[PDB]
Each structure stands twice: as C-alpha cells, then as structure tokens.
Structure 1
Amino acid sequence: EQLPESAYMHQLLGLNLLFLLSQNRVAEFHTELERLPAKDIQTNVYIKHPVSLEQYLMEGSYNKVFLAKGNIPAESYTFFIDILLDTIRDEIAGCIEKAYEKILFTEATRILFFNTPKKMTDYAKKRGWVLGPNNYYSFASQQQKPEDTTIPSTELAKQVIEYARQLEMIV
C-alpha cells in the first residue's frame, strides 16, 4: 500500500495504452481505464492525454490524429506513435482511390499526405487494391460487389425440410 510516487508510471502506462490502442484494443483501453478510476480524473496527464485522444478517436479520427499529434513532440513515444501512424486507416482508399482522385490531402490523414512520392504510390498500389476481386477503385464497386442470388431460397427450403423433421419430432 506504501508504493511511493514513481514518475515512470504515468508514461509507461502511456506507452502501454499507446501501443494498446495502436493494436486496436479498445476493450483493453477501457479495462485500463477501469483498473484505475482514481488518478485518471485530473492527474496522470499522460493517461489523461490519451483519453482526450479517446475523445478524438470517439470522434472516429482521421483529422484528429494530426490534430492530436501536434502535442506529443518529445517523450520517446516514437516507436508507438509510428504504429499509430500505421493504424490510421484506409477506408477512403477502400471507396474512391486507387489511381485517381487527384489527391486526398485536406483531411489530415497521415498516410494520405505526401502528394506523389513512391511512399503513397506504394500505398495506392499496396498489395493490390484492398477490395480484391472483379473490380478496381479506379471505377469503384461502391462496396465490394457481392450481390449473389436467391440460391439461399433452396437452403431455406432445406430449413423447411428439417423444420418438418422437427415438426415430426414434435408430432
């Protein structure tokens, strides 16, 4: 009970929480929040700053990643804020991109900066075109193009067969 003030605790929990969100563990984010409700009220500023970041990611951040990266300049968080810049997402690349939308620069998404070096050219051609089969996003599918059939009328007909079986089991 007599654990004294260890100032490493704030930023080691900060790096824990930082990589913990960087690997997309929001259940683990809030289990971290709930294992310490006391000091995370007004003190523990390097946990209180990731929960302002949780307000920013509650907002579903692509703008607020840069708007919150503005205020973490030097704490040796670098290895894990790089993984945060990795875990910034690619849904607009999964909707409208893949060799042309002239530039998606004005939304503060970290990857979607850097107008055309081979960094974002590599990213616009990264491992294909994240959708997959039958289409590009040069002309979008607008989701994925599933639109299969009503072949499942036949397997709901199978459901009817074992439904009549379960009727027979019931009488």
Structure 2
Amino acid sequence: YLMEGSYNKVFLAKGNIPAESYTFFIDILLDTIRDEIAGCIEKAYEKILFTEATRILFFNTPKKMTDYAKKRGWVLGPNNYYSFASQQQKPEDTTIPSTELAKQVIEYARQ
C-alpha cells in the first residue's frame, strides 16, 4: 500500500487488527507518513491551504500549525503554504565530470 499513491486507507485498515495492538509499528508508520508527505510536498508546488496539510493527512489541528515550522518552515502568509521554486539551472560547465567522457576514445582505445 506504501507502493501505491494511496496513503490514508491504511489507518482504517489499521482499524481492525488481528493481533494485540499493531500500534508500536503504527507509530513508525505515522513517522514515515510525516516525512513522506513532507518530502513529497517540499518540491515545487502552488500553496495548498492550511486545512489540507492540517486535517486531511493527520493531526486534527493539535499542533500542526507548529509542526509546520518544526519540520520545514515555509512561512505563512494569507492562508497559503507556498513552495519555493528550487529548479536547478543545469550549469553548463561539464568539464570535471565529463573530461574523461570527453576522452572516451584515447583512454579506452589504445592508438
């Protein structure tokens, strides 16, 4: 289920447990959901509202307004959670990592 991009019916599937608790692992499951939703939203995005990042995932607004600053930052403006751009320019140097690639005749074909 963690390989599918559904990430919320696991907890209702956690609602029925055929063993004693299955919660000690579910805590680590919570942890992993936290940093996966972090690392998935931290790329370029266009400013989801407070409620979607707050209640739709987990934490019925206990501390998520604080957890927001705890994890990443992304300072709040008029009720939006904007992602900064973060697109690499493709620096056109390619001398050090591709000088042997540039030499991909002589230092493999002995002439």
TM-score by length of 2: 0.49
Secondary structure in structure 2 of the residue aligned to 1:164: coil
Change (3 A) 1:151 1:133: farther
Does the 8 A contact of 1:98 with 1:138 survive in 2? yes
**TM-aligned CA distance change 1:112 to 1:103, over 3 Å:** farther
Superposed displacement of residue 111, structure 1: 9.2
**1:71 positional shift:** 2.0
Aligned residues: 111
Q: Distance in 2 between matches of 1:124 and 1:157?
A: 46
Unaligned residue ranges in structure 1 (runs of 5+): 1-55, 167-171
RMSD: 6.8
Change in 2 beyond 3 A, CA 1:146/1:88: farther
Which whole-Å deviations, capped at 9, do the CAs of 1:87-141 have from their partners, x for residues lacking one?
A: 2253443344599976678889999423654356335532778999999973132
1:85 to 2:9 alignment: no
Provide the TM-score with structure 1 as the length reference.
0.37
Q: 1:129 to 1:164 in 2, by over 3 A?
A: farther
Asked if structure 2 preserves the Cα contact closer than 8 Å seen for 1:129 and 1:136, the reply is: yes
1:156 Cα deviation after fit: 0.4
TM-aligned CA deviation for residue 86 of structure 1: 1.7
Contact 2:42 2:83 (C-alpha < 8 Å) held by counterparts: yes
Structure number having the greater helix percentage: 1
Cα distance in 2, alignment partners of residues 117 and 98 from structure 1: 25
Is 1:130 the counterpart of 2:75? The answer is yes
My pick for the range that moved more, 67-76 or 90-99, is 90-99
Identical residues among aligned pairs (%): 100
Structure 1 residues 143 and 84, CA, compared in 2 at 3 Å: closer, same or farther?
A: farther
Larger radius of gyration: 1
Structure 1 residues 83 and 145: alpha-carbon distance in aligned structure 2, compared to 1, 3 A threshold: farther
Q: Select the structure with the greater relative contact order (CA < 8 A; seq sep ≥ 6).
A: 2
Do the aligned residues in 2 keep the contact of 1:63 with 1:108 (CA within 8 Å)? no
